[PDB]
Amino acid sequence: RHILAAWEGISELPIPALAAWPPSHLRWLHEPLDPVQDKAWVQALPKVELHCHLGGFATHGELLHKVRQ
Amino acid sequence: MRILLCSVGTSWAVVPEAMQLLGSQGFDEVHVLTTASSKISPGVEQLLRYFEMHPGPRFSISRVQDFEDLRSEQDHMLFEEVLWRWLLQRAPQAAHRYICLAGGYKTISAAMQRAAALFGACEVFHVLCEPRFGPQGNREASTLEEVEQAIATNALRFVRLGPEPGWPQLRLLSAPSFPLESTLQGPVHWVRASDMRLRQHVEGVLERSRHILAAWEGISELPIPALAAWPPSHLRWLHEPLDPVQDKAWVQALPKVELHCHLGGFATHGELLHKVRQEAANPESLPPVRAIPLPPGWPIPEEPIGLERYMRLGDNNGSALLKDPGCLRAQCRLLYEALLADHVAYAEIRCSPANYASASRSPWVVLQEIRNHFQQAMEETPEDRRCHVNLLLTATREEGGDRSRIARHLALAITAAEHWKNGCRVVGVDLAGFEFATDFEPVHRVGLAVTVHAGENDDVEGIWQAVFKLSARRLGHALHLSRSPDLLRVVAERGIAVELCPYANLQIKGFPLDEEQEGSETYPLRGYLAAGVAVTLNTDNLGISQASLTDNLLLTARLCPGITRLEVLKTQVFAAQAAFANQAERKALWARLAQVPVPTDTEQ
Amino acid sequence: EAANPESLPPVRAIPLPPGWPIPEEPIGLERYMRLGDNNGSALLKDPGCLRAQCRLLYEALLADHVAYAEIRCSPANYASASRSPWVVLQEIRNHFQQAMEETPEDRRCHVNLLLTATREEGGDRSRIARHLALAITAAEHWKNGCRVVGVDLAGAAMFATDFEPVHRVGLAVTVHAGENDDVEGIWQAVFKLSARRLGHAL
Amino acid sequence: EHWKNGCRVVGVDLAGFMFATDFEPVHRVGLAVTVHAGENDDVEGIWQAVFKLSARRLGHAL
Ligand SMILES: Nc1ncnc2c1ncn2[C@@H]1O[C@H](COP(=O)(O)OP(=O)(O)OP(=O)(O)O)[C@@H](O)[C@H]1O
Ligand SMILES: Nc1ncnc2c1ncn2[C@@H]1O[C@H](COP(=O)(O)OP(=O)(O)OP(=O)(O)O)[C@@H](O)[C@H]1O
Ligand SMILES: [Mg+2]
Ligand SMILES: [Zn+2]
């Protein structure tokens, strides 16, 4: 059901696996992002990092103390 | 709102008992579909009597005039069609749709179940009544008093099979598109169906959905998403080697993309040359028709003839001939006609307006005339079949000659880039030479795309300089990429398209044809494809080569052994992505590409 | 005479230094440029305001008895999303050609055009490229009447600009001398840019 | 060229160059270049990174 319903307009979805998503979930995906309420969904997302300096990771706090130890 | 579309046959008690599935709430309105058999009459009067009292819900009766008994299968098909039409009409929404299948024949009950599956029903139940009624108390309620007793004694067990959403494609079918012929006869409706379009539409939708679900798995390996709706046999046919002969008609119908085509090499001989000459404005200035003999076996020469002979093979048209306005107009119109005959959806033509300028006609005038001829030809064609033409300016490097033409062409391109923002546009410059970086910073500063045209050399330094010095977004005739793994990897990574002209390459350079397996001299098309390079197949010169885009796509089957048809579709997609078009033209091209011809020889 | 009076910018208030035209003290170049901010690209993007400028200017040369003039224009500064730089130049040329032909051939001031490729304070050399390409395109287009006769280099990038193409099409080059005493600048104009005239070489 | 599996060196990021004279060797060997923008609100640097440094990514191009 879900795949056929979302088949029309499948080139507008970044990940092609989103077609099998329920239509209500796709409508939610098309709604503005909520930082307070969407913390868990973003936290569980598989992400790609392309800009991260190694020398600016543990610059203060417990991480810095661990690095020094 | 809550409706209940029930079925009545010899037993009319189904409807009154079905009127209590919810209980005290009942149904705001109910309907019944049955046959026109005479035996169904007394049940109809009993139902009307039952409706006389408890007239809370709405009431109506519909019988099929062409289906009474179960003595035929065509009658069964007609009954199914009428049931679907009546469900569409008397039940606009399945969310507010309660369906009862207790009444009707066994085939009738199956029809209600199948219709609920196809079009969806908010809830499907089956009404039951204990036989503790009637004489002897061994028969179920079959009269008004007995029906009320059953409804008043809780003698009706209701089995609900659960909601049933149906098919997304079968939930947006409005009844007005499937009208049912009704004839008011008293307090009942006599419904009839004209055509069986509904059943054919449902069957086609179901088959297409099954094909889509079967192809869902490998949806990222299909160049065009619309290929998932093909039958699995078709998708298997698409993975087999391309047949140069049997597949001619399938390739001829493909919507193709042309990226490497020269305006001056189109009508170089034959009848097209004579038509172009006849169109001339002043027939006296026409140069005499030189005698240029084609090599034996043309367009497939026995041995390669190099680039100088190939270029000289088209001296009857071009700079000396297109200086006539009428000849230029005929050239443009005939080129657009040839593009239309090949089903090309997007084409980039290469022109040298400075070569066609005269005392009274500046390069700007020639360029404007070419652009307006192509735009007028485009506008004279239906949008569904219209080939979109864009223009590239060729800034060639003469052998120690006129270097002012390069400057004139670059300035012309930079000006035409802003001049036109719709229809036929000037989208880039073709650099046939350097195979000079200072001359092209202005080209990059205004957003013009650059394509470098390799020729008469097999060096990788030229390709390296074009990629990293000229910032070329496409490469023409880069037949020696495999000879440098770093260069090939860079080309694949940066997404630089490679323009290949099968016939032109074969005639100028020469490659083995119809071999068995890929040797060290085979055409590099499949080696490039396996390396991740965006490869596009083009014509170069329609006239000098005597080959169309279809002919080149077919010859790829002999230059490359085992090349599949999915590979030609991939080349078309690569060309669509590598075109210098804007968002609107790109959308139109992608809409056109989504219509691939259906194979006809999928039987082996 | 604006065609779209609903788009004309408000008439900014610009005060002239006391003693104009003869100031009591040199006001520099930056203050000089700002003094003309009520006209130019602000007003000349209007098709109707670009005619009054071209006609109110030709009758100022007639009242001064000028016999030959070369006007410096920047057609790319007046180009909108619907009027390309070539359309603006196409119009400036024909607004001067039309005015010339409507004057008796005895008091007719002959007007030619120079395209000013001004160095920009953003490194944005796209404007330079468009003007140089426009001048090369208009050099061959018009052989009679009003003509584009050269480019005005009002300003190291130009030495990396490859001004050779303008030389190959027969265009002349004029260079404004910078506000600094850059003797090394006038040297490169004569021998690198092949300038045939020098502006403000004091 | 040393490593071909696992963790690899896939490119270099220029951090304030517009000057690609000493970068032809990196493009020759196939190393991708990402140009990292500075605190200056200039667009000429972006043009040089795109066409002079042949950058494939841009950092903080605001
Ligand atoms: N957000 C940033 N913008 C610009 N430069 C940065 C930024 N973050 C780090 N850098 C610079 O990147 C350079 C190299 O990166 P990295 O942080 O890994 O080096 P480092 O020697 O450990 O850093 P540092 O001594 O500056 O903390 C450092 O010199 C730092 O100045
Ligand atoms: N296959 C090719 N390989 C390399 N250069 C080519 C090829 N085909 C055309 N050219 C170059 O393109 C230039 C302009 O292309 P076009 O075919 O439109 O020629 P033209 O304007 O008719 O002039 P002419 O045929 O007299 O050279 C030609 O002068 C030729 O130098
Ligand atoms: Mg001003
Ligand atoms: Zn070619």
PDB file of N, CA and C in Angstrom, chain B residues 228-267:
ATOM      1  N   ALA B 228      10.203   0.939 -13.716  1.00  0.00           N
ATOM      2  CA  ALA B 228       9.730  -0.039 -12.745  1.00  0.00           C
ATOM      3  C   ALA B 228       8.338  -0.556 -13.074  1.00  0.00           C
ATOM      4  N   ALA B 229       7.538   0.213 -13.807  1.00  0.00           N
ATOM      5  CA  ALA B 229       6.197  -0.206 -14.188  1.00  0.00           C
ATOM      6  C   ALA B 229       6.188  -1.138 -15.392  1.00  0.00           C
ATOM      7  N   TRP B 230       7.360  -1.557 -15.876  1.00  0.00           N
ATOM      8  CA  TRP B 230       7.441  -2.490 -16.986  1.00  0.00           C
ATOM      9  C   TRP B 230       7.255  -3.923 -16.501  1.00  0.00           C
ATOM     10  N   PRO B 231       6.698  -4.788 -17.341  1.00  0.00           N
ATOM     11  CA  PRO B 231       6.609  -6.206 -16.995  1.00  0.00           C
ATOM     12  C   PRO B 231       7.990  -6.788 -16.765  1.00  0.00           C
ATOM     13  N   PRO B 232       8.125  -7.742 -15.842  1.00  0.00           N
ATOM     14  CA  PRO B 232       9.454  -8.323 -15.588  1.00  0.00           C
ATOM     15  C   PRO B 232      10.106  -8.892 -16.834  1.00  0.00           C
ATOM     16  N   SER B 233       9.321  -9.435 -17.766  1.00  0.00           N
ATOM     17  CA  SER B 233       9.896  -9.913 -19.018  1.00  0.00           C
ATOM     18  C   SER B 233      10.529  -8.770 -19.799  1.00  0.00           C
ATOM     19  N   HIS B 234       9.886  -7.600 -19.804  1.00  0.00           N
ATOM     20  CA  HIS B 234      10.474  -6.444 -20.471  1.00  0.00           C
ATOM     21  C   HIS B 234      11.773  -6.018 -19.798  1.00  0.00           C
ATOM     22  N   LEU B 235      11.794  -5.991 -18.465  1.00  0.00           N
ATOM     23  CA  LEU B 235      13.010  -5.624 -17.752  1.00  0.00           C
ATOM     24  C   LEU B 235      14.127  -6.637 -17.961  1.00  0.00           C
ATOM     25  N   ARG B 236      13.786  -7.901 -18.217  1.00  0.00           N
ATOM     26  CA  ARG B 236      14.797  -8.887 -18.585  1.00  0.00           C
ATOM     27  C   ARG B 236      15.287  -8.667 -20.010  1.00  0.00           C
ATOM     28  N   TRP B 237      14.371  -8.331 -20.921  1.00  0.00           N
ATOM     29  CA  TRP B 237      14.751  -7.985 -22.287  1.00  0.00           C
ATOM     30  C   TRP B 237      15.682  -6.783 -22.317  1.00  0.00           C
ATOM     31  N   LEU B 238      15.522  -5.862 -21.369  1.00  0.00           N
ATOM     32  CA  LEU B 238      16.343  -4.661 -21.304  1.00  0.00           C
ATOM     33  C   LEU B 238      17.756  -4.927 -20.803  1.00  0.00           C
ATOM     34  N   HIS B 239      18.031  -6.117 -20.273  1.00  0.00           N
ATOM     35  CA  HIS B 239      19.353  -6.463 -19.772  1.00  0.00           C
ATOM     36  C   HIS B 239      20.119  -7.384 -20.713  1.00  0.00           C
ATOM     37  N   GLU B 240      19.605  -7.619 -21.909  1.00  0.00           N
ATOM     38  CA  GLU B 240      20.246  -8.480 -22.887  1.00  0.00           C
ATOM     39  C   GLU B 240      20.989  -7.652 -23.923  1.00  0.00           C
ATOM     40  N   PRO B 241      21.950  -8.252 -24.623  1.00  0.00           N
ATOM     41  CA  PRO B 241      22.736  -7.486 -25.596  1.00  0.00           C
ATOM     42  C   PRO B 241      21.853  -6.863 -26.666  1.00  0.00           C
ATOM     43  N   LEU B 242      22.204  -5.641 -27.057  1.00  0.00           N
ATOM     44  CA  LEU B 242      21.443  -4.923 -28.068  1.00  0.00           C
ATOM     45  C   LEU B 242      21.621  -5.577 -29.432  1.00  0.00           C
ATOM     46  N   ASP B 243      20.508  -5.809 -30.124  1.00  0.00           N
ATOM     47  CA  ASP B 243      20.544  -6.386 -31.461  1.00  0.00           C
ATOM     48  C   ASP B 243      20.547  -5.267 -32.493  1.00  0.00           C
ATOM     49  N   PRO B 244      21.593  -5.136 -33.311  1.00  0.00           N
ATOM     50  CA  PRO B 244      21.670  -3.981 -34.220  1.00  0.00           C
ATOM     51  C   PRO B 244      20.573  -3.941 -35.270  1.00  0.00           C
ATOM     52  N   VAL B 245      19.923  -5.061 -35.570  1.00  0.00           N
ATOM     53  CA  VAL B 245      18.927  -5.137 -36.632  1.00  0.00           C
ATOM     54  C   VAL B 245      17.510  -5.188 -36.069  1.00  0.00           C
ATOM     55  N   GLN B 246      17.230  -6.162 -35.202  1.00  0.00           N
ATOM     56  CA  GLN B 246      15.882  -6.296 -34.662  1.00  0.00           C
ATOM     57  C   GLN B 246      15.512  -5.124 -33.763  1.00  0.00           C
ATOM     58  N   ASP B 247      16.501  -4.458 -33.173  1.00  0.00           N
ATOM     59  CA  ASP B 247      16.264  -3.344 -32.267  1.00  0.00           C
ATOM     60  C   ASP B 247      16.286  -1.993 -32.970  1.00  0.00           C
ATOM     61  N   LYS B 248      16.324  -1.976 -34.302  1.00  0.00           N
ATOM     62  CA  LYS B 248      16.341  -0.709 -35.025  1.00  0.00           C
ATOM     63  C   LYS B 248      15.078   0.098 -34.754  1.00  0.00           C
ATOM     64  N   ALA B 249      13.916  -0.558 -34.789  1.00  0.00           N
ATOM     65  CA  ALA B 249      12.655   0.146 -34.595  1.00  0.00           C
ATOM     66  C   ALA B 249      12.472   0.632 -33.164  1.00  0.00           C
ATOM     67  N   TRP B 250      13.026  -0.079 -32.181  1.00  0.00           N
ATOM     68  CA  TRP B 250      12.941   0.384 -30.801  1.00  0.00           C
ATOM     69  C   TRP B 250      13.841   1.591 -30.564  1.00  0.00           C
ATOM     70  N   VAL B 251      15.044   1.580 -31.140  1.00  0.00           N
ATOM     71  CA  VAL B 251      15.952   2.710 -30.989  1.00  0.00           C
ATOM     72  C   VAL B 251      15.431   3.928 -31.738  1.00  0.00           C
ATOM     73  N   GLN B 252      14.824   3.725 -32.909  1.00  0.00           N
ATOM     74  CA  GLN B 252      14.313   4.848 -33.686  1.00  0.00           C
ATOM     75  C   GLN B 252      13.211   5.606 -32.958  1.00  0.00           C
ATOM     76  N   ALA B 253      12.510   4.961 -32.028  1.00  0.00           N
ATOM     77  CA  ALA B 253      11.421   5.589 -31.296  1.00  0.00           C
ATOM     78  C   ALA B 253      11.853   6.162 -29.953  1.00  0.00           C
ATOM     79  N   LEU B 254      13.102   5.959 -29.554  1.00  0.00           N
ATOM     80  CA  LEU B 254      13.571   6.482 -28.282  1.00  0.00           C
ATOM     81  C   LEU B 254      13.658   8.006 -28.333  1.00  0.00           C
ATOM     82  N   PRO B 255      13.320   8.695 -27.242  1.00  0.00           N
ATOM     83  CA  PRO B 255      13.606  10.133 -27.140  1.00  0.00           C
ATOM     84  C   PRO B 255      15.072  10.351 -26.800  1.00  0.00           C
ATOM     85  N   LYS B 256      15.824  10.877 -27.759  1.00  0.00           N
ATOM     86  CA  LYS B 256      17.271  10.960 -27.664  1.00  0.00           C
ATOM     87  C   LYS B 256      17.717  12.380 -27.342  1.00  0.00           C
ATOM     88  N   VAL B 257      18.970  12.491 -26.912  1.00  0.00           N
ATOM     89  CA  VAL B 257      19.594  13.764 -26.574  1.00  0.00           C
ATOM     90  C   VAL B 257      20.838  13.912 -27.436  1.00  0.00           C
ATOM     91  N   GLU B 258      20.923  15.016 -28.169  1.00  0.00           N
ATOM     92  CA  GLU B 258      22.075  15.309 -29.011  1.00  0.00           C
ATOM     93  C   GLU B 258      22.906  16.409 -28.365  1.00  0.00           C
ATOM     94  N   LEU B 259      24.203  16.149 -28.200  1.00  0.00           N
ATOM     95  CA  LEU B 259      25.111  17.102 -27.582  1.00  0.00           C
ATOM     96  C   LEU B 259      26.268  17.518 -28.472  1.00  0.00           C
ATOM     97  N   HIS B 260      26.605  16.733 -29.493  1.00  0.00           N
ATOM     98  CA  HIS B 260      27.721  17.027 -30.389  1.00  0.00           C
ATOM     99  C   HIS B 260      27.200  16.982 -31.822  1.00  0.00           C
ATOM    100  N   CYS B 261      26.844  18.146 -32.361  1.00  0.00           N
ATOM    101  CA  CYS B 261      26.346  18.246 -33.727  1.00  0.00           C
ATOM    102  C   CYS B 261      26.803  19.569 -34.320  1.00  0.00           C
ATOM    103  N   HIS B 262      27.352  19.517 -35.530  1.00  0.00           N
ATOM    104  CA  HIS B 262      27.865  20.697 -36.213  1.00  0.00           C
ATOM    105  C   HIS B 262      26.855  21.176 -37.246  1.00  0.00           C
ATOM    106  N   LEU B 263      26.577  22.481 -37.237  1.00  0.00           N
ATOM    107  CA  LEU B 263      25.618  23.045 -38.181  1.00  0.00           C
ATOM    108  C   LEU B 263      26.128  22.964 -39.614  1.00  0.00           C
ATOM    109  N   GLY B 264      27.418  23.227 -39.823  1.00  0.00           N
ATOM    110  CA  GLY B 264      27.974  23.277 -41.160  1.00  0.00           C
ATOM    111  C   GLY B 264      28.276  21.939 -41.793  1.00  0.00           C
ATOM    112  N   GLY B 265      28.153  20.848 -41.043  1.00  0.00           N
ATOM    113  CA  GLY B 265      28.411  19.531 -41.589  1.00  0.00           C
ATOM    114  C   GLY B 265      27.156  18.741 -41.895  1.00  0.00           C
ATOM    115  N   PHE B 266      26.013  19.422 -41.982  1.00  0.00           N
ATOM    116  CA  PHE B 266      24.737  18.719 -42.114  1.00  0.00           C
ATOM    117  C   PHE B 266      24.445  18.322 -43.560  1.00  0.00           C
ATOM    118  N   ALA B 267      24.246  19.305 -44.438  1.00  0.00           N
ATOM    119  CA  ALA B 267      23.873  19.041 -45.828  1.00  0.00           C
ATOM    120  C   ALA B 267      25.103  19.215 -46.714  1.00  0.00           C
TER     121      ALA B 267
END
